[PDB]
Write a protein that binds this ligand. Sequence first.
Ligand SMILES: [Mg+2]
Ligand SMILES: [Zn+2]
Ligand SMILES: [Zn+2]
Ligand SMILES: [Zn+2]
Lengths: 115, 67, 477, 528, 98, 34, 44, 98, 257
Amino acid sequence: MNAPPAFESFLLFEGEKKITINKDTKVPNACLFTINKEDHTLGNIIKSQLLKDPQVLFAGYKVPHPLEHKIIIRVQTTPDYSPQEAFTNAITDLISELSLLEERFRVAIKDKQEG
Amino acid sequence: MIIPVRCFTCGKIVGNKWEAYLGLLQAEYTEGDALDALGLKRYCCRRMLLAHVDLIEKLLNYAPLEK
Amino acid sequence: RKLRRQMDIIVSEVSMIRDIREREIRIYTDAGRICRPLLIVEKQKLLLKKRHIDQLKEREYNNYSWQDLVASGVVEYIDTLEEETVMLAMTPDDLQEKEVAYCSTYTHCEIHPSMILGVCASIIPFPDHNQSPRNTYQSAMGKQAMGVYITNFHVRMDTLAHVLYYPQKPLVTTRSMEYLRFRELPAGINSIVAIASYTGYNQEDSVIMNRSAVDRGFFRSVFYRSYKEQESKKGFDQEEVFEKPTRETCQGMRHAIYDKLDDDGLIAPGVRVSGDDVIIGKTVTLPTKRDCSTFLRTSETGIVDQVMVTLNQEGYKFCKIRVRSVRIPQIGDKFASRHGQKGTCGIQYRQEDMPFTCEGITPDIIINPHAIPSRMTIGHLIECLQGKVSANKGEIGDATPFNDAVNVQKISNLLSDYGYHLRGNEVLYNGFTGRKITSQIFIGPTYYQRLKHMVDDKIHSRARGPIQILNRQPMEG
Amino acid sequence: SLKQRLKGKEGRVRGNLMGKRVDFSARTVITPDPNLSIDQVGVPRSIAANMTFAEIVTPFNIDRLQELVRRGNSQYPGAKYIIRDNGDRIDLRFHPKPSDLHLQTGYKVERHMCDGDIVIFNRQPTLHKMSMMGHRVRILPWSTFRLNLSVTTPYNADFDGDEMNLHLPQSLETRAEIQELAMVPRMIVTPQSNRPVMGIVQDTLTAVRKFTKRDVFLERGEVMNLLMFLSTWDGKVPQPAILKPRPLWTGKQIFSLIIPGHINCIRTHSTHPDDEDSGPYKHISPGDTKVVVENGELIMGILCKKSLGTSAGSLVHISYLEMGHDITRLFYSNIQTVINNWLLIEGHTIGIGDSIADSKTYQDIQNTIKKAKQDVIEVIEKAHNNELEPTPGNTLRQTFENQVNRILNDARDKTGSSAQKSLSEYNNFKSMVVSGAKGSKINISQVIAVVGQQNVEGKRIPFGFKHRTLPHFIKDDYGPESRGFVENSYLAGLTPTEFFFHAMGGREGLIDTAVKTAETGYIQRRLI
Amino acid sequence: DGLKYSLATGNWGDQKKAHQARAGVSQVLNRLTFASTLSHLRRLNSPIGRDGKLAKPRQLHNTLWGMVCPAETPEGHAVGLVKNLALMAYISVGSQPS
Amino acid sequence: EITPDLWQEACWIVISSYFDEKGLVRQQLDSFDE
Amino acid sequence: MIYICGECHTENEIKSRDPIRCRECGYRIMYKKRTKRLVVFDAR
Amino acid sequence: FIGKIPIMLRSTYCLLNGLTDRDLCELNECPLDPGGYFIINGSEKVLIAQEKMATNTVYVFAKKDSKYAYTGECRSCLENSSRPTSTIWVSMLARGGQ
Amino acid sequence: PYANQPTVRITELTDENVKFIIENTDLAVANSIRRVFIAEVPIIAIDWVQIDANSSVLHDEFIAHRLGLIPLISDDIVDKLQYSRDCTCEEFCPECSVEFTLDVRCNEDQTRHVTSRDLISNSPRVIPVTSDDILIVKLRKGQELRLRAYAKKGFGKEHAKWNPTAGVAFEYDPDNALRHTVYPKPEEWPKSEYSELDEDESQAPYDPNGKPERFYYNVESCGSLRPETIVLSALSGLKKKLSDLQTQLSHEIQSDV
RNA sequence: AAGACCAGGCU
Ligand SMILES: [Mg+2]
Ligand SMILES: [Zn+2]
Ligand SMILES: [Zn+2]
Ligand SMILES: [Zn+2]
């Protein structure tokens, strides 16, 4: 009787912003990203890509509660670089890697099928 | 009641293998050989056919309560 | 004793006792004496021989049975106070054969030591590897395990009937379950159980469940509620009638919807019925009319399954209605193994978040390892290993209590032949990050039972409701 | 009669004046939630929808109360009733009544219970005043009450079909009382024994020990995750213990960030020997087995039940006494969250290989059992030939039983010690017993080596039949096997007679548990 | 009506003398599971009052071997007072000593 | 003549014969019939 | 009203105040056909 | 006609006695159902075996506070015909009398 | 400072199964790919069911539950179909649903097995996969089952019936060189089918400089989608999710700026 | 309505 519907895992309603950006006052050049209606699939990807950036000092994510569908990402970068720029660059690099992987997987499928 | 459509653990379809399993077991395959013949490799799909109880046959003995 | 064994003029139910020291001989033909069968031992040899076993193995189409076995003087019924004069041997092959002798005057031998257990305790695999309080807990909890209680349940009109979608016979079985007919009406499901501390939601006695498995029909069930209602004539002109009331004609009227009733004031089967819905419209002519219609139990949210109209003892119209609802297992619901390990469902994770083996197998149930060390239910672990062996072998394991032909080393040696670590451990990968788990987690199939107790039947809240008549205090219940 | 109306329990005085049924109360099953704070409780929406709190309209909250009244009883957060200055009650649940939805200062709006509300939470056997503590409401899906696991030991609750009661105070004054008096962080230390009541329990304690060992080296991403799960973290990454080959942090180095303020404490691990304090290496313990926390930093040592548990002078107790209730709450929550999330990496389990011992250990155990049985046979033979001399103040039967019990207890203790010595460092039974999370050295001994003697009414198994215990034994048999000594272990399995004797042994415990409760409760009531 | 009432209500005796009549006999058959039905059909009850704090009649006696299940009893005030029958146990029906 | 350590088959055969003849509720039925 | 019989499965035409005995066979048990109005299920 | 006696299901006087699987299925009766219960007003009622002390046998016990050091008794019944449940006691008065 | 350059080898490719190896990529990449294999791949499954007559011994939602678990050939039109929540119409149409009809009656004496072959669809591309046959229900003589069913588009997050896959095997570092797992006794553990070491040695020597680097895969299809196209759809879906975050995150940066 | 008995659950 209290079961939530099947779609709160994957779907926004009126008023929910997919991403919310809040600055962190504890440490300079630190930001906090809130991603609504996402899970580990995307947070782990983004954190792993961000840890490769030499100008990123901190990168981590968590699910505040498993029964809720929400991701929080904290990014701290060096002084002459914005964590927003770090986030955009990580996303672009991930997309670029995935496109190349897709093309090479298609080439491998075609080579496997016609011998 | 009746064989489940999917294995609960992995999701392989075992709903179309009950009759073939029964036929092989009647044709003198043992349970282990029959499961291998049907193509059920890992223990999660094997337990489905190995531990199934077909009560739907018992339920079909009773006359329907309508025409 | 010769005449009793020949059944000549002394019935086998008569017990005879000689107390040598007090010089008394007592014979009881009285009713109510409890007794059990035993094999007769003459000298050091059983009277049961290979021809008896051959005839009993050819029992079909030979009209040779346990009564013919009794009539041959092979087995004997012995009650409690005759056992005082009996020298019993636990097994023939062990205690009859010559050793550095304890005794040589054995007079009887047990059929099998596992016959000392009851009906509910005979379903426990490896009961001699568990603690006795846990065996008692399992004996009590087995009566609450849900399943198919009787095959003709679709005919029966019973209140509070629970039936399970996909019962399975246990992969690890006791030799005595065949005589309890547990194969024909199973009360549980074999499930892949991993004993690990995953996310802290299975701590204490809780369980993590696989939501993807639950979506495939895992431990899904149906609950049937039956409703009785009676037409009667009590007053001279005061009578009860099944009819569909009009909106403001009767005195009693609730804002509930009467639109679902038929011409005779009975909901037809197949109609979805929720809270406050009127299943039976019964009006009592007020000497205009009083509404004694019956409602559903609050939030039952079911569907009318069967409607029956008859005549009772007196001859008035009588009606039974059966409502069903499906209940999919939730967080608050109670689950238990065959070893006394009971627990609610702490949380449900989809298949993506569950830990997985190299083969893609994910556990259906995850239980905390902390339930094992203090409760000392080793039979659970041995069952888990034996079921893993059996699912690969294609056979059904034998867990009869006191058999020396099964031990943990032999089960491990058998399991090692199928490409698995011989103690049941297996390398698991984290579901969230994909990294390996440093420890190797004990996994395997174990028989689990869903219990009658569910959170939907226990949750309750109150704010300024009904008031007791005499104390002007809140109601009970 | 009237005497019967007033006299007994459920009579007027005791059943309707000293205790009575109340409104605004809820009951349901409790399930764990390690993501809640120690003062928070998870509440289902249906219960929170039914339960209401009357709130007075002021110029500060009039807009919010009007929004709640517009939402009404259909949508989850709104009002159920509106109460006028004259006491007339307006119901919003049946009809929209748009003329009556007007609000002014002085009205009372009965809103639905929201996040942040204060509730008393209770478990029924109700033995001391920590059985009822005030919690802070957090609203969660599904239909079970959820609470932190350190709070389980105050209530004596486990998550096995257990239900707990929820009381919601209905006035601001009583809300203030519960907040200021009975909140969970204010009840950490009991006045009964001046000890902390809540402690680190279950997965978290074993993970504490395994995390705080010397061998734990944490990589950069793992450190960032664990710091992401810290609520009191200042945001500065500490310099790793190891720098150049690769940057490597240590478990103690991250545990020092969990430890609040500047706390000074010295404890000892469970496996601490007494030899280290005498000779050298007093301050450089080779086994890592002394605990030193200086200036709020863990310098050396392995934590266990003796450091994070509920005992006098524990780290949690010292933290409470130095820092107060508000900081100790965050200390419990941070320990829980960060160490569960680290245990996600290493994992913990139990299995058959944890209960199987070495082949040489099995031979040693069998030799010890055979020697003990031969000694009991020799003692029986000494009594049979009347060579046994009776001990002062004791009967011949009493001294015979004392000697046999001494022999069997020595045998069981020696076998248990051998089994405990045979355990490896990776054994999960040892990992659970040493940390004090659950289980014990006698449980390990009974699992691996020998279940031991079975006793009924504090005596060895009696003669229910004429001069014997079972029809399988001969009359006048005082040997260990006949009188209930279980030679086998749980792993090996019990013989039929030993199984029956163990059932007899457990029946006594069940009976005692069922019987003692009435007398204990009657004593408690009379004392109160 | 005497047979019908004493089998329906469970009070074993005259309805007017119900105070002296023994109660608890003839419960409603348990249909939750087949094992539950079998255990209910094979069950024994000690007439000793449930309120008695005396432990002695509740303990597992040696003479229950092979006759009464050692594992199966309810938990609560009726520990050891409600006993189930062993699988091979048979209760004598009685005969005349002529 | 003697069963030579075929005993596990033999004892369960005789148990099967017993339960095939009597069943589980004979104490109810025998008592009522008598 | 249309009532299926409990032993012989013949439907009866019947009305209020008619005592229940089946026209074909005299049996006293009747069942009400599942209604005509439709109910929607999710296949979850 | 003097009355109606309820019938235990599947007994020698039940209508299900000696029927086969096909007959039981035609009767909408489960073959696996053991019987051994009654049907009273539509409900299923099961008589629970009642334990009791044996009759016609001499027993000797010792009470703590009683005037008697030893108390022998014999709960006697006339073959369960005309049964009065008559009990004689034969007791030995305690020597501790001052 | 930059993206991977991964490579793919494919070893086995059948109608049921795809074994492929992904080299030179992150562990998080591989885990998210195998996770998207289960939960983010769209497929067609029966979701709305209306039953007209059901005189079988299984109840209405029992039969409806079985119907939803029957796989449907999703190979072609799952890219063409809309989600129902995105469709422009008020009620079921060919751009957002597929209609199925079942009508079986048992007139003959011998028992009839109602199988997935008895399901009839309005369009030829989306037959049930099994066309042995998946058994829905058995009918005695005189029993009847008539119903209508509409199939929609969803993915594994919603319900396990929308899982396109029959278990994904995933493995990396078959010889335990990174020591991500610690064997108390290495000699007791069977070797992986991808192990590259001799019969005599148990584990590879410890590699302090290594990082997880080859991911071994084995995607087994349930029949709705070919195992070759399951991976492509998963990759495209993950890329689309990342592109949707890039898009909406660019707007949130512009809102702060 | 109310009263009675019984069964089960958590300590
Ligand atoms: Mg509990
Ligand atoms: Zn499977
Ligand atoms: Zn008819
Ligand atoms: Zn459309």
